[PDB]
Amino acid sequence: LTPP
Amino acid sequence: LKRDLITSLPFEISLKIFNYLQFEDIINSLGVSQNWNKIIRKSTSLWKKLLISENFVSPKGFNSLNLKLSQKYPKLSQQDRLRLSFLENIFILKNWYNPKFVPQRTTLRGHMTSVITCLQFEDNYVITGADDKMIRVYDSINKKFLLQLSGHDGGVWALKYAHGGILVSGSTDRTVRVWDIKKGCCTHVFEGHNSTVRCLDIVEYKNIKYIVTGSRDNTLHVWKLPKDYPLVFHTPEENPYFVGVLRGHMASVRTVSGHGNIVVSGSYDNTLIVWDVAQMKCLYILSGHTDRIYSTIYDHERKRCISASMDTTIRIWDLENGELMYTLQGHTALVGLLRLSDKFLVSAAADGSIRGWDANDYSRKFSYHHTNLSAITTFYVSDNILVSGSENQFNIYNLRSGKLVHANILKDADQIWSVNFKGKTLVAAVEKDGQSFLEILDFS
Amino acid sequence: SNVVLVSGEGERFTVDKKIAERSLLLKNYLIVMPVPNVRSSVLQKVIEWAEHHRDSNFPVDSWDREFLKVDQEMLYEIILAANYLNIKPLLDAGCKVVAEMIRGRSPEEIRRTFNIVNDFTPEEEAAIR
Numbered sequence: 001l002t003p004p
Numbered sequence: 005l006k007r008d009l010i011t012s013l014p015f016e017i018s019l020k021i022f023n024y025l026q027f028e029d030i031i032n033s034l035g036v037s038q039n040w041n042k043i044i045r046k047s048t049s050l051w052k053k054l055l056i057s058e059n060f061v062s063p064k065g066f067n068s069l070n071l072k073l074s075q076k077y078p079k080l081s082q083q084d085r086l087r088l089s090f091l092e093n094i095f096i097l098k099n100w101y102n103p104k105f106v107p108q109r110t111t112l113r114g115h116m117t118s119v120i121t122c123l124q125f126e127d128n129y130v131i132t133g134a135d136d137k138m139i140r141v142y143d144s145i146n147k148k149f150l151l152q153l154s155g156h157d158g159g160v161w162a163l164k165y166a167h168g169g170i171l172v173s174g175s176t177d178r179t180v181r182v183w184d185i186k187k188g189c190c191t192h193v194f195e196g197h198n199s200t201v202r203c204l205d206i207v208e209y210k211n212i213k214y215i216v217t218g219s220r221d222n223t224l225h226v227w228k229l230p231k232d233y234p235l236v237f238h239t240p241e242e243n244p245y246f247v248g249v250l251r252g253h254m255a256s257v258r259t260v261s262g263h264g265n266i267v268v269s270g271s272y273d274n275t276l277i278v279w280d281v282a283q284m285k286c287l288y289i290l291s292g293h294t295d296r297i298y299s300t301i302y303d304h305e306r307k308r309c310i311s312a313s314m315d316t317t318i319r320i321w322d323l324e325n326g327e328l329m330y331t332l333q334g335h336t337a338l339v340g341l342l343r344l345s346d347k348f349l350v351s352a353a354a355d356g357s358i359r360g361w362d363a364n365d366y367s368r369k370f371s372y373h374h375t376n377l378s379a380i381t382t383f384y385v386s387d388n389i390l391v392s393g394s395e396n397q398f399n400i401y402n403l404r405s406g407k408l409v410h411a412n413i414l415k416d417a418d419q420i421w422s423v424n425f426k427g428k429t430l431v432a433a434v435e436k437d438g439q440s441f442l443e444i445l446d447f448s
Numbered sequence: 449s450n451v452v453l454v455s456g457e458g459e460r461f462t463v464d465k466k467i468a469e470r471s472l473l474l475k476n477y478l479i480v481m482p483v484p485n486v487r488s489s490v491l492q493k494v495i496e497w498a499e500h501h502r503d504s505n506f507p508v509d510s511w512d513r514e515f516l517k518v519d520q521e522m523l524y525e526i527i528l529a530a531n532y533l534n535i536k537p538l539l540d541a542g543c544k545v546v547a548e549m550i551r552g553r554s555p556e557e558i559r560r561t562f563n564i565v566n567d568f569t570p571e572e573e574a575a576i577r
Contacts, residue, residue: 001121003135003161003176003200006563007520009527009546017531017543024547035555035576038567 011039019047027054027094051086059387060093062346064305096428097388099447101402103409107430107445110147114440115140117159120433123422124165129185131171132422132433132442135159139173140442141185144429147444153183155190155234162204162217166229172215174201180217182230193236194243196225199256207262207281214247214281216267218257224250224269226281248284252277261302261309266323268309270297276311278323288326292319298340301349306364310349312339318351320366330366334359341380347387348403352380358392360385360403370406374399382423391430393420398432414443452480453495455488463495470498472534486532490525493518497538506537508544516545520562 010018022030022044030050034041044050055061061069073085080088099105114120115134122133129150130142139153139160158177165171169185180201182192199221206215206229213229225240226247237243255272262268265282276290276297295315302309308329309321318332318339337355344350348369352358356374361367374380374394383392390401398414401407414420419435428448434441451465451474460480469475483491497515516523523542530538550558559566568576 001119003121003159003202005519005521006561007524008562008564009520009524010562011564012524013527014531017527017539020540020543021547021550024544025550029547029550029552031577032553032555032558033550035568035573036558037564038572040564041576 008039010043011037015043015046018043019050022047022050023053027090031091045081045083045087048083048086051083051090054090055086055093058090058094058097059347060090060097065346093427096447099428100389100400101404101409105447107413107447109413110444110446112142112147112149112442112444114433114442118435118438118440119419120421120440121159121161122163123424123431123433124163124171125424125426125431126165127167127169129165129169130431130442130444131163131165131185133160133163133173134440135161135176137175137177139163139171139183142442142444144431144444147446150185151188153185153188153190155181155183155193158200162201164204164206166206166213170229172204172206172229174204174217174219176200178219180204180215180225180227182215184233187233189233191233191235192230192245193234194225194227194245195236195238196240196243196246196249197221197223202256202258203260205260205262205267207264207267209265209282216260216262216281218260218269218271220256222251222253222255222257222271222273224253224257224260224267224279226250226284247281250277250279250284250286252286252289255296258297259299261300263302263304266302266304268300268302268323270300270311272296274313274315276300276309276321278309278326288321288323290319290321290326290328292328292331293317298338299342301342301344303344303363310342310344312342312351314338314340316353318342332359332361332366334361334368334371337379341383343383343385345385345387348385350383350385350390352383352392354379356380356394358383358390360390370403372399372401372408382420384424386425389425391423391425393417393423393432393434395419398423398434413445417443450479453491454480454482455491456483456485457488459488459491461491461495463499464502467499467502468495470501470535470537472536473532475534483529483533486529487525490522490529493522493526494529494533494535494538498535501537504537509541512541513545516542 116136124131128144137156141150156175156177158175160175162174180194197219204217215227227245240246253271259270278287293313299312311319320329335353337353339353341352349361356377358372360370378394400410417434421433423432430445432443449465451468453461527542
């Protein structure tokens with residue numbers, strides 16, 4: 001899960 | 005003719021006798037006679053042993069346990085205190101391990117976005133964060149929503165709680181903010197990072213607490229945790245709380261683990277660095293993994309460092325000189341999660357596999373695999389239990405019998421974002437039909 | 449080489465010094481040692497256990513189980529003797545057997561077992577589960  | 009051996013033997017000898025009995029037998033004995041009751045309630049060892057046998061406390065955590073029990077029960081004695089604690093604990097564990105026992109479920113609204121990015125669970129507070137740039141606080145006792153904290157101009161992605169209702173956050177908004185649940189506002193706004201705050205931790209050294217934030221700017225800024233409220237500090241130099249930046253990584257600082265004046269960071273440059281926050285200098289550079297690190301743990305007790313990389317391996321390092329100790333190979337996919345239980349080192353991978361290694365020698369203790377081979381999204385562990393979640397799966401495992409206790413408790417969940425548990429309360433941030441929710445499970 | 453143990457009833461028991469050394473008390477004594485206030489029958493019983501365990505190593509036992517299958521008085525004195533003679537293995541054996549008499553038993557069951565008296569007033573009783 002990576003941040004935009 | 006008979007003889008009350010217990011009363012007649014010397015105190016010490018009778019106690020050895022009781023140490024050879026399972027707790028149940030000890031409780032019945034407590035009702036055999038006034039003298040038996042007196043002899044048993046006179047012992048602190050009796051219960052200290054049990055508590056440890058059942059893994060409700062460890063030698064290191066003992067004393068603190070006592071202090072907390074004394075604050076809880078002033079008019080009780082150490083003996084009776086420990087016994088109350090054990091009886092209360094052994095029955096919650098009984099419920100957890102009972103296949104025929106079903107927890108009470110409470111479901112609360114989550115964030116505006118279906119994905120939760122982070123979750124803390126301390127002091128009867130369940131705090132959750134999301135890419136909807138919001139922070140939700142909940143009450144774990146009355147099982148309900150308390151308030152929401154707004155401020156970040158970007159989705160929140162890292163949040164750590166700090167005793168007193170104070171909590172720190174980090175977001176794509178590139179800021180590090182400190183909040184006060186009590187007041188329900190953002191009391192500080194620390195700017196500096198030239199990119200998204202990806203991770204953070206709080207360590208304490210010489211009664212001083214420090215905040216350590218890793219970023220996609222390749223650095224780790226260090227700030228001291230503070231003792232009209234939205235106090236913004238556009239500049240680090242002028243920010244009293246700023247301490248400095250730890251430069252060394254050539255890529256995003258993906259994970260961070262610390263304790264005292266020692267912090268360890270994992271980057272995407274496939275490396276890890278051990279920093280001495282106090283001297284604000286690089287101590288060791290752990291190299292060897294052939295791909296990005298997604299998780300590291302600083303085992304202060306043993307003075308070591310565990311690392312989990314996308315190269316599918318786990319590495320144990322000796323922080324007494326920085327050289328590699330062992331390389332664990334029990335995953336065929338990216339290893340992004342790690343936890344250090346008093347008794348286990350647990351790791352989960354993108355292939356749905358979960359492994360438990362002895363916390364000291366790393367011999368294979370247990371291994372689980374989610375049936376639908378989906379990537380392990382989250383999990384939590386204690387010496388007695390393991391809770392893991394992945395798409396369409398939420399499992400509870402009894403680490404003693406190694407068997408799966410419950411597998412359908414949160415069946416209607418589509419994603420288990422974050423799971424955390426402590427005592428008789430289990431919590432999970434999940435996704436159901438394109439929406440997030442907070443799940444609270446009761447085992448008391 | 450032999451050693452001689454005298455029971456509290458004046459009886460002399462000859463036994464191998466090496467085997468006798470099971471008793472740390474005898475061991476530290478560093479040829480005739482007294483065993484004050486220990487019944488002959490008890491001491492004899494202790495010696496038998498020491499000779500039988502001449503080549504055993506200690507950091508439940510099937511034989512000990514039978515050996516201790518004696519009356520409550522006896523068991524009590526054997527544990528005491530063991531304790532006085534400082535023979536840890538034997539003491540533990542004796543303690544394990546007594547715990548085994550309690551194991552899985554109820555307050556009433558246990559009371560009968562030792563013929564103990566229930567001195568809990570009706571009230572104190574209820575307040576105990």
